[PDB]
Amino acid sequence: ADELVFFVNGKKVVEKNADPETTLLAYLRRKLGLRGTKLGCGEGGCGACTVMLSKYDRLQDKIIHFSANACLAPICTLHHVAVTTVEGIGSTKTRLHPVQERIAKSHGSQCGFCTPGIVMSMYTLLRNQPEPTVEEIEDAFQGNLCRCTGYRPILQGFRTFA
Amino acid sequence: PKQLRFEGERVTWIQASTLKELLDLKAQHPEAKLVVGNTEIGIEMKFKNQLFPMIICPAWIPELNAVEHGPEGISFGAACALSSVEKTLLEAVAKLPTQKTEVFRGVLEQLRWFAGKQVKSVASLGGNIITASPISDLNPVFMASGTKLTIVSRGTRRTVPMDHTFFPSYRKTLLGPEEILLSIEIPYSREDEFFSAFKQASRREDDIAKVTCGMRVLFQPGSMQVKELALCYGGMADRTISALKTTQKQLSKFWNEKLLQDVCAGLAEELSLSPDAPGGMIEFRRTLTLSFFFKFYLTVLKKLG
Amino acid sequence: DTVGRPLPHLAAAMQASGEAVYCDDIPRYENELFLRLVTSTRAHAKIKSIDVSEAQKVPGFVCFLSADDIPGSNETGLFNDETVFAKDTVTCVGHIIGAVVADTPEHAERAAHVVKVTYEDLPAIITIEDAIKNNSFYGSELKIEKGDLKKGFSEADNVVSGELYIGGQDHFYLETHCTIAIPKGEEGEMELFVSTQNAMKTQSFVAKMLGVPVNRILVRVKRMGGGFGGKETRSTLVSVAVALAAYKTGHPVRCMLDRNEDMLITGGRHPFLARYKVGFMKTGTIVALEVDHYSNAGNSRDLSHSIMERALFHMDNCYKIPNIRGTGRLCKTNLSSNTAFRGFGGPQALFIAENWMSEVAVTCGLPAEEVRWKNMYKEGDLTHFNQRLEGFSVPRCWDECLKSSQYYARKSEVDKFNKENCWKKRGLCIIPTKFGISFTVPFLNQAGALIHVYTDGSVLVSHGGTEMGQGLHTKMVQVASKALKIPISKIYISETSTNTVPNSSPTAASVSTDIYGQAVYEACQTILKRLEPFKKKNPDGSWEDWVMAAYQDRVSLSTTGFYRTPNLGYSFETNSGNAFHYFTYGVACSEVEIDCLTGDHKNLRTDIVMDVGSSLNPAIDIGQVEGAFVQGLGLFTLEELHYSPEGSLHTRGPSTYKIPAFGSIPTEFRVSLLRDCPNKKAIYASKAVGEPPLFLGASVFFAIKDAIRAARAQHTNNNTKELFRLDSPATPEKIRNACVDKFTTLCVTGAPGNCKPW
């Protein structure tokens, strides 16, 4: 029985008895106590559980950064992968990330349940493209639902990054 | 990388480091589920209560992750993410001349309002194809284009073009039990070859009744006379199907209003839905199979002149 | 004083960082267990056996709960017509039968699917048409009826009659239903943390099920990740079962519903069938009107009767109808009980209104703005239920919207586009709304607050309203700060709890800001009176000085407030007395482009002018206009719930059920709050804003209809006075099938015809 080793916000995780059936969302919320990442559907559709994943791409040099749905990612696929959650990019206790700060001051968050995933979708874009186009910004959120805002204020807060 | 083995309450997961390992694992355990993105297996397990007691994850294997340019097209390993396929084809499309990228731009059109960045960054090419959902948006494009599939078991290797026979039954492919999908070559389009792909806005049932297609015509050189014609559809049966009776009739006919009429006659009849057909929208679905061909018909006349 | 200022939501930054705690983000006790509901897979059946042998061997497996485990009462629901757990018969597909308790949520799910229920089917009634035909209704016919109906119809140049269906809607709050129940071990005591808009009825129904006094049961609500009406009552289906688990095990128990359970079980917006008949002049002035409404209620009364009163109160939209009869029936069906959803019967009856209004205009061959404007109430008019319209501001909204949206110029560009385009069409439509402000059951227009000032001068405000994303707590803090004359930074609200404010009404009916703002304001005023001697003694001193002087002089710095909406009491017999305290008004103009070959459309541009009085927070208020409009656009165009013939929901997730997405919204999206329009009837000259702008989403629907009319002029026939039925939601299926042409047809084929034209 081999050890599964990954990172969550820069911190090594050694899981000595990984269960194949454990999703990453379950593991963050209930083993690691990191509950900013939300459950909205458990099926890939809403984005509430959006995280960033990083890994060394052996075929391209490059560490690559991309977004995933924590609700569908088996932790057993994540050996030597680095996970970044909403609590890994900033906090009110320390310093907010610009993504977090903008969505909040722009009236992009009402109930707030979708806000962590939208933040991590936006954060991922910017890790790949620090000067996105307005187009790239809108397409960043294809996988993220919000029931509250009607979307205008979110996209508007974020065009400041373009 | 060494092979890892995780063992749970009900499931054993082997993470294969090497192609050779996989083909041996799958020969010992032909039942074993390949998992790459889990964007399908996770849903089957959680919502359909499928237990698969053996999982191989072949995601580490280079070969399954290779992107190879070639004289006939661009090959992607089966474990490659749709985001990568998407990115590479966009570069192919910006770089190559319109007449070579007809099929590519069909893939991109299906990839456009497909899921979201999260799904595409993890969903594998090979997982879509072998999943064989009746409503797969890619498999109609792959079938209509004869996209070549390299299939390996331990000892054997073969490359087949995707055609109607690659999908015999519901949720089933024409890979033998010890076999895996290794790579997929999506072809350049030739001169006098035009391609379109379309999809239904609405989906409403879990794996049925969303109309989606790929449409390919090859003319005799410089001409408007049909040499080959493929029209393949998802969301009209329990699998991806080709309108084969209808398009056979048009070989050596010309691209005119009469062809338009005859293809609609053929499609209306050959893809006809019983009133009790799974998913309903019996009439909407029929209108779309014709309306999609008419958009293709008109696009192809624009390309001809 | 931050009143009138665009202050970000108080929790926004913590919501951004994932530090805001929702109910499942609360830490587990070391012993805390997990509940999973067991639910009917049949519409109507007898339960023959339950068998828990396989769930029993499922690792950490604790127990299965059923009707027999309940210490007090199995009778529940707003009208005492539901079971906590079904005993002898099941009456809908998500009907809760029992519950598995286990040590992890994973183990509780595993055990729940392997519980074997054996059934014997019974005749089921699913559609409104099944219920109409079996005479399967709850209660008697509600009715409103003014003027002379045959006399209006006799004087009528034109009479049009018809039928319309409007589909239901899932709330799709991003956070599903969730309760944590902690049993204390002493005297029946229990402490619950729930995602609910109704802490009072949670507290009551838990107490009733347990057979314990209400004073034993504490309910706490920090926030919800959305409610939209669906956590007004049906939250208790989870809350009550989790409490029994807690009772029975002695351990803390929690449940968060998965999306697919949430949509099956917890109910949605009411589908409506209407049969209508209008009588009108050649000018398009309406003279008679009769509408029979049928709601699909589902398997329990819930808020069904009250949704129908609000329906009937809105069947006029903004239109003076001198002779007018509206009726309503609630159909009793073997579907999950339907409930409150932002709008509460108003969107449905207003959509019926706007549909016949659209038919009148087409029948008369007149421009639709003019027929609507012509028929609009003026200041001071009475409505069909006899309440007068003071500060009736829809004409300013109309004017300003007509002008700001450049409607008349865009009208020509839409015509031009349709003369030049064959297989794509555009539509443009300006639509009004008025929505009546107050709960329809008068006794709910009551609000309490408790305010404490601590000896450092810091203020803790508690009120009976809950936060679900709508900025209530932000607005209450803005008010307290204005009323007390201290910085917002000195004021905090923590949560809502039945031990700080008892007997509260649901945070519903858009009135929370009005009524809790009024209660909070009165607490502040009593605190200011108690402080005034010390202010008098030390006028150039500080709040902190005075608060300490009042403490050291043994003056209390804790006080209740309360508020009662005055002059309410509409009677159905007699048909008189005020139903509402006032009305919120707005106007939306929307343009679309349809693809006549596919059914797709783009929302091209929308302009909205809303009257919200003097806004407390114009950022929160424009955000309410925006989200409300987009849930309306979802209702009328995207969101479609679909069932099997045998009553089972097919659409149980985001992959089969389509709420608006980032790319769904109008490319050009403008909301304006009407200027210089203070409301004397509510707190600081403000108006309710929550549910009112949702119906304005219909402006996209009537824009799509107009774009279908244009497609049908092109390819289907030549009569420009044609009336074709378009039900809601206008999906791609409905949009495409209405665009009758050579494909629909097949006249290409050919053919023969047709209608199809050639």
Ligand SMILES: Cc1cc2nc3c(=O)[nH]c(=O)nc-3n(C[C@H](O)[C@H](O)[C@H](O)COP(=O)(O)OP(=O)(O)OC[C@H]3O[C@@H](n4cnc5c(N)ncnc54)[C@H](O)[C@@H]3O)c2cc1C
């Ligand atoms: C929210 C959401 C929306 C989606 N929308 C769309 C859509 O609009 N259109 C569309 O087409 N799809 C859509 N999908 C489906 C998605 O594209 C597929 O689920 C995905 O590509 C499957 O890839 P995977 O790597 O996740 O496969 P997995 O779930 O890991 O595996 C799926 C199947 O493929 C098999 N498999 C994988 N690799 C191989 C191999 N090399 N050889 C043999 N078998 C193999 C496995 O054994 C298994 O049966 C959506 C999915 C989600 C979650």
Ligand SMILES: Nc1nc2c(c(=O)[nH]1)N[C@H]1C(S)=C(S)[C@@H](COP(=O)(O)O)O[C@H]1N2
């Ligand atoms: N973000 C958000 N806004 C929302 C809701 C919600 O759940 N989330 N509910 C709406 C509904 S249905 C109503 S009645 C009001 C209720 O609160 P209020 O009375 O303070 O507006 O908020 C509206 N706006």
Ligand SMILES: Cc1nc(=O)[nH]c2[nH]cnc12
């Ligand atoms: C309970 C209730 N009564 C009303 O009159 N209007 C409402 N809107 C939302 N909920 C309600």
Ligand code: MOS
């Ligand atoms: O008044 Mo909103 O809760 S239906």
Ligand code: FES
């Ligand atoms: S929880 Fe909805 S996408 Fe993961």
Ligand code: FES
């Ligand atoms: S803010 Fe509530 S879902 Fe986005």
Ligand SMILES: [Ca+2]
């Ligand atoms: Ca309703």
